[PDB]
Enzyme design. Structure first.
Site, short mmCIF file in Angstrom:
data_model
loop_
_atom_site.label_atom_id
_atom_site.label_comp_id
_atom_site.label_asym_id
_atom_site.label_seq_id
_atom_site.Cartn_x
_atom_site.Cartn_y
_atom_site.Cartn_z
N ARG A 262 0.84 -1.18 0.00
CA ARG A 262 0.00 0.00 0.00
C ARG A 262 0.88 1.24 0.00
O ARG A 262 0.47 2.31 -0.45
CB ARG A 262 -0.89 0.01 1.25
CG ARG A 262 -1.85 -1.17 1.36
CD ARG A 262 -1.13 -2.49 1.65
NE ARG A 262 -2.04 -3.64 1.65
CZ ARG A 262 -3.02 -3.83 2.53
NH1 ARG A 262 -3.23 -2.95 3.50
NH2 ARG A 262 -3.80 -4.91 2.44
N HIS A 273 2.49 16.02 -0.98
CA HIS A 273 1.69 16.51 0.14
C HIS A 273 2.32 17.76 0.73
O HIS A 273 1.63 18.68 1.15
CB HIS A 273 1.52 15.42 1.20
CG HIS A 273 0.47 14.41 0.87
ND1 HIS A 273 0.22 13.31 1.65
CD2 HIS A 273 -0.40 14.34 -0.17
CE1 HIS A 273 -0.76 12.60 1.11
NE2 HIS A 273 -1.15 13.21 0.01
#
Ligand SMILES: NC(=O)c1ccc[n+]([C@@H]2O[C@H](COP(=O)([O-])OP(=O)(O)OC[C@H]3O[C@@H](n4cnc5c(N)ncnc54)[C@H](O)[C@@H]3O)[C@@H](O)[C@H]2O)c1
Ligand SMILES: NC(=O)c1ccc[n+]([C@@H]2O[C@H](COP(=O)([O-])OP(=O)(O)OC[C@H]3O[C@@H](n4cnc5c(N)ncnc54)[C@H](O)[C@@H]3O)[C@@H](O)[C@H]2O)c1
Ligand SMILES: [Cl-]
Ligand SMILES: [Zn+2]
Ligand SMILES: [Zn+2]
EC number: 4.2.3.4
Lengths: 383, 378
Positions: A262, A273
């Site tokens: 993941r 981000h």
């Protein structure tokens, strides 16, 4: 034909052109038997798609006795509705129905990432949990947000702070929604599609490079009456979008001891981000993630892990789809008059390093995010 | 002796006298490693029990390094704190800490059913879920609310409308909490203990019948600050309370069926409560419900009249009301009346008993509204 993809060892995703128009209502009442269906969306999305569905639902509820009810809740558009206030708004609204909505309720999340996170969280706690389905209407929602169960709302202190992991019973991906999605939002969603391919399949990545012009032309074209925006390139658009969606489903469905497959999904998000923490809300998530992908790509090249040609492909591909590949992008600058992203601020926003490194298009370095020296990161972000 | 029980497969319940005073802190830091522990309780409970723990925590945090932190949140007492506002205030508080409470946070629910439901729900959604432990301080919480994962808050339109199933990592049952629990609350909790026995073990029920005088005396006697309320009858209290708790734990683990039995006396009990609350407590209402539902089964030729009487004597023995005509209840509910219609209306299947410790069906049975009425009416 409707394509089906499974999530967590079971059928869940149904994708095709026109599902919303003629398939979802029948399907819900059939495979999601309930007396109450609560549809949540925003005024933009809803004013365009809610009328037809109301009719298609009425037409399907009639071939049954008694007739199930469809309750509609329209929230204002924007990141602002993903709040405790709206969660409590929709809830009290649902509890105040005559009769109130019960544990058999099936909530329909008709929207993009915002409506998706909000509705999913509402459903997760309504009487400790009720079923819901995702009907993503944005490209990013179709391949990212609507998959995996991550649900939540925002607090003045930050994004997705209060929420839950609540899996949807089904995820209907009607590619026709992309016919009315704003050009900028569509481009925005492509950042995840390109990211996914970039870390999973070189063939897929190449197909994206080859399909850019065609796809983008369709996204920008002036649709004449009687036409559908994507007529003539439906298989291309379906194959491209579902490839990403499918990958997200696989990664989320793959556990039985994995460690962090993941993790690779965060490729380009470490820097992405950080950039977004500064440029938001002027600059969208995908736009920031795009730049993060380029930076992180350069980093891996700087560490002698990625060939310089892969960086260039990564760059041409993003630009080909209309995404920015630098922090001084003309469009970005115009939208953020007076905003700068200094290395320090970016190195800071990041510390709040482990960056997924690529060794080649379609091939990650480690099976997880790698640990890199802060100094190597700074060099990459240097002017 | 630190007794241990298993919920959902394996151990999670730890019961004994003194756990709070000298075991939870060490246990949490050991078995629930974290850098942050958030304690939630109300001013009543906390003003009595938070000081000791603070020291007991500090004493254990020093042994580990770097030393963890204990953050305390005191909410006002009452059903009123089980609201969205208190959930958000607690969440905002946690996020505000320096540094903010992360996903490693271990929330401690120190209280009864109210603090338990509130804290459990807070923990379930904090960053999509964080660990928490139940430290029930009321009898009802020890044998019921703190067990099962059911968490939630109320809304002006109803109770427990917004919540989640979130299992606690551990449930510490320190019987000493019952030393300061108000007599009425203690009696209230006995309704679940008696209910549990009534539907699972005739032996256990009998043990409750014989312990009735002793327990109540300990409960009603005047204890002086410094002496333990239950000295001399600690094993009795432990065996009685843990029996109930272990059964709830068992059923919650089996699994629509076996869980339905846990609602005996609640069909009528909830109907009664919908009218008499908040004046009358849950257990007090459930008690009356047990008698009614017991006579209903007798009415249907399923229950021996003798079991009804034992059920009636046992409740009373522990100080619970066994009728709507109870003086205490009538005095307390001035300005209210439970008509038969209202009760039936509120009721919109009852678990039937065939004998003390023996249910009729393996689940709630379907009964005709008429047979119910002839039992609700005078
Ligand atoms: N794992 C997860 O749950 C996850 C991960 C990624 C993104 N997200 C969340 O997604 C959110 C952003 O979502 P998004 O990018 O989909 O944006 P969005 O939902 O805000 O949609 C963007 C705009 O498109 C409009 N729109 C949506 N569908 C339309 C359509 N087909 N036709 C016309 N207008 C349409 C909306 O009204 C809105 O104005 C963020 O809040 C983010 O936190 C969640
Ligand atoms: N499945 C579940 O989670 C579940 C099931 C049943 C009941 N409940 C809920 O539980 C709540 C009822 O909780 P309750 O009956 O435990 O009451 P409560 O938590 O409201 O406590 C009653 C009173 O006793 C005080 N108190 C608590 N323990 C004390 C102690 N050791 N010493 C001194 N004072 C003490 C409290 O401050 C309070 O005033 C309700 O809100 C109900 O809906 C939850
Ligand atoms: Cl909430
Ligand atoms: Zn993303
Ligand atoms: Zn109860």
């Amino acid at each position: 034909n409707p394509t089906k993809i499974s999530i967590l060892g079971r059928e869940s995703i149904i994708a095709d052109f026109g599902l919303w128009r003629n398939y979802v209502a029948k399907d819900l009442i059939s495979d999601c038997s309930s007396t109450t269906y609560v549809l949540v969306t925003d005024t933009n999305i809803g004013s365009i798609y809610t009328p037809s569905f109301e009719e298609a639902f009425r037409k399907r509820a009639a071939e049954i006795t008694p007739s199930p009810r469809l309750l509609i809740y329209n929230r204002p558009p924007g990141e602002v509705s993903k709040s405790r206030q709206t969660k409590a708004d929709i809830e009290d609204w649902m509890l105040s129905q005559n009769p109130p909505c019960g544990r058999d309720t099936v909530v329909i999340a008709l929207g993009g990432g915002v409506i998706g996170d909000l509705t999913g969280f509402v459903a997760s706690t309504y009487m400790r949990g009720v079923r819901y389905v995702q009907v993503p209407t944005t490209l990013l929602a179709m391949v990212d947000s609507s998959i995996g169960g991550k649900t939540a709302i925002d607090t003045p202190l930050g994004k997705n702070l209060i929420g839950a992991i609540w899996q949807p019973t089904k995820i209907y991906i009607d590619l026709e929604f992309l016919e009315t999605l704003p050009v900028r939002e569509f481009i925005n969603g492509m950042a995840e599609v390109i990211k996914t391919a970039a870390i999973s399949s070189e063939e897929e990545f190449t197909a994206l490079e080859e399909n850019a012009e065609t796809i983008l032309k369709a996204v920008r074209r002036e649709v004449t009456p009687g036409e559908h925006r994507f007529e003539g390139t439906e298989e291309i658009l379906k194959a491209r979008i579902l490839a990403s969606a499918r990958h997200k489903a696989y990664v989320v469905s793959a556990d039985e001891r994995e460690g962090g497959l993941r993790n690779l999904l965060n490729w380009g998000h470490s820097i992405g981000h950080a950039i977004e923490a500064i440029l938001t809300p002027q600059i969208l998530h995908g736009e920031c993630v795009a730049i993060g992908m380029v930076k992180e790509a350069e980093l891996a090249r700087h560490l002698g892990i990625l060939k310089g040609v892969a960086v260039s492909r990564i760059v041409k591909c993003l630009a080909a789809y209309g995404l920015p590949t630098s922090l001084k992008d003309a469009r970005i600058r115009k939208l953020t008059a007076g905003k700068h992203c200094s290395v320090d601020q970016l190195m800071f926003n990041m510390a709040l390093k482990k960056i997924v490194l690529l060794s080649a298009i379609g091939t990650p370095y480690e099976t997880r995010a790698s640990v890199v020296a802060n100094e190597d990161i700074r060099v990459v972000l240097a002017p």
